[PDB]
Design a protein around this ligand. Structure first.
Ligand SMILES: [Cl-]
Length: 115
């Protein structure tokens, strides 16, 4: 069901390598709904090419807009399995430090703080 369960390690690496070749200024991000989430909708896709100059605060806003959330819906985002240290961090730096060995940057969202 999850991205890693649907694609082999080889397939994931080769896709990241393709993204470096054809979309060099983008960060390859996998964004998935927490498996127990009951309030927030699922996204229309899983793999996102994020401009590498945005910060985490902006990425949160982007994802909230893609989910068409209103102001009273809570949204929490994990990166590489843990909470964000700061929303101010540039995504190019987050990628360097938090990328998976397959080359994707993995994120999970939920409406509660306890995924
Ligand atoms: Cl590009």
């Amino acid at each position: 069901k999850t991205f890693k369960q649907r694609r082999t390690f080889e397939q994931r690496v080769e896709d990241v390598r393709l993204i470096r070749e054809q979309h060099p200024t983008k960060i390859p991000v996998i964004i998935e709904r927490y498996k127990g989430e009951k309030q927030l909708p699922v996204l229309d896709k899983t793999k996102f090419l994020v401009p590498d100059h945005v910060n985490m605060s902006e990425l949160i806003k982007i994802i909230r807009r893609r989910l068409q959330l209103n102001a009273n819906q809570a949204f929490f985002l994990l990166v590489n399995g843990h909470s964000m240290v700061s929303v101010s961090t540039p995504i190019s730096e987050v990628y360097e430090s938090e990328k998976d060995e397959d080359g994707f940057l993995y994120m999970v969202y939920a409406s509660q703080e306890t995924f």
